[PDB]
């Protein structure tokens, strides 16, 4: 549960939760990045 | 459950939740990025 | 459940939830990006 | 549960939670990065 | 539970929790980085 | 439970918790980094 | 790029590749099955699935071969 | 890039690759099964799955071969 | 890059690779099964799975071979 | 890069690789099974799994071979 | 890079590798099973798993071989 | 790099490697099973696991071989 939130029976407040993640080029199962110069 | 929210029996407030994720080029199952210069 | 929201028996407030995701070039199952210069 | 939050029967406050993670090039199951210059 | 939070029956305060992690090139199960120059 | 937090029946305070971890190139199960120059 | 192949000079090749596959219910970017569903009885007899490959190479004076 | 292959000069190759596979319910970027679901009975007889490969190479004076 | 292969000069190769596989319910970037689910009965008879490879190479004066 | 292979000059090779595998419920970057789930009964008969390889090489004057 | 292999000059090789494997429920970067779950009964009959390899090489005047 | 292998000049090799394995529930970077879970009954019949290798090499005037 990446960057998840959970609560029960709770009162809130201003800016109670803030997340500032960066996921450029992320969460890659089998995607390769390669080159093959035989020349 | 990436960047998910969950709650029960809870009172809210201004800006109770904020998320600022960046997912450029993300969540790739088999999509490769390659070049093949035989020349 | 990416960037999902869920709640029950809850009172709201101004700006209770805000999401600012960026998904340019995202969620790619088999779409490759490649070039093949034999010359 | 990476960067997850959990609570019960709790009162909130301003900026109660803040996360500033960076996940560029992260969470890679089998995605290689290589080159093969026979020439 | 990397960088997780948990509590029960607790009152909050300003900036009660802050995390400043960096995960560039992190969480890699089998993704190699190599080159093979036979030439 | 790397960099985890846990508490019960506790009152908070300003900046009650701060973490400043760096995980560049971290958490690698089988991902090698090598080269093989037969030439 | 699943089951990718590359080559040069296939001079005289034979039977180079046999990609038998069952991609049923596959490649779903966004989807929700039985989302907010209550009381649904799911008895679909999806039955056999996947490859059921058989290959018999037999030389004889008399021969009897049966498949499936 | 699953089951990737590369090569040069396949001069005279035979039976180079046999990629039998069952990719059912695979490759899901975002999905939620039985999300917020209550009372759902799930009895699908998904049945056999995966590869069931058989290969019989037999020379004889008399022969009897049966598959599945 | 699962089950990757590389080569040069496959001059006269035979039976180079046999990649039998069962990738069912695999490769999930984001997913949630039975998320927030209450009372769900899950009896799916997923049944046999994975490879069930058989290979019989037999020479004879009389022969009887049976598979599955 | 699971089960990786590399080579040069496969001049006359035979039966170089047999990658039988069961990758069911594998490769999950982000996922949550039975997340926030209450009362769920899970009786799926997932059944046999993994490789069930058999290889019989037998020469004879009379032969009887049975598989699975 | 699990079960990695490297080589040069496979001139005349035979049966070089047999990578039988069961990667079920494997390779999980982020996941949470039965997270915040209460009362869940888990009776899945996952059943046999892993490799069940058999290899019989037998020469005879009369032969009887049975597998699984 | 588990079970790594390296070599040069495999001129005439045979049966070089047999990597049978059971990688179930393996390779977990971040995960939490039964996290914050209360009252969960866990009776999964995971059953047999790991390799169950058998290898019978027998020459005879009459032969009877049985596996599993």
Residue numbers in the entry:
A (entry chain G), B (entry chain I), C (entry chain K), D (entry chain E), E (entry chain C), F (entry chain A): 2 to 40
G (entry chain L), H (entry chain J), I (entry chain H), J (entry chain F), K (entry chain D), L (entry chain B): 2 to 69
Paper text:
In this research, we determined the cryo-EM structures of amyloid fibrils that were isolated from the kidneys of two patients with the vascular variant of systemic AA amyloidosis. Reconstruction of three-dimensional (3D) maps of this fibril morphology achieved, based on the 0.143 Fourier shell correlation (FSC) criterion, a spatial resolution of 2.56 Å for the fibrils from the patient I and of 2.68 Å for the fibrils from patient II. The two 3D maps were highly similar, C1-symmetrical and consisted of two non-equal protein stacks (stacks A and B). Stack A is formed by residues Ser2 to Gly40, while stack B contains residues Ser2 to Phe69, reminiscent of the two groups of fibrils protein obtained by mass spectrometry. The fibril proteins in both stacks show folds that are dominated by β-sheet structure and lack the α-helical conformation of natively folded SAA1. There are four cross-β sheets (β1-β4) in stack A and eight (β1-β8) in stack B. The β-sheets show a notable left-hand twist, which is defined here in the direction of the fibril axis. In the vascular fibril, the Cα atom of Ser2 is 3 Å lower than the Cα atom of Tyr29 in chain A and 5 Å lower in chain B. In the glomerular fibril, the Cα atom of Ser2 is 6 Å higher along the z-axis than the Cα atom of Tyr29. These very different z-axial positions of the N-terminal ends of the fibril proteins lead to the different tilt of the sheet β1 relative to the fibril z-axis, which explains the different directions of the fibril twist of the glomerular and the vascular fibril. While the glomerular fibril shows a symmetrical distribution of the positive and negative charges in the fibril cross-section, the vascular fibril presents a clearly asymmetrical charge distribution. The current vascular structure allows similar conclusions as the fibril protein N-terminus is also buried in the fibril core, indicating that the first has to be removed in order to allow the formation of the fibril structure in the vascular disease variant.
Systemic AA amyloidosis is a debilitating protein misfolding disease in humans and animals. Serum amyloid A1 (SAA1) is the precursor protein of AA amyloid fibrils. It is an acute phase protein that becomes strongly upregulated during inflammation. Two variants of systemic AA amyloidosis have been described in humans.
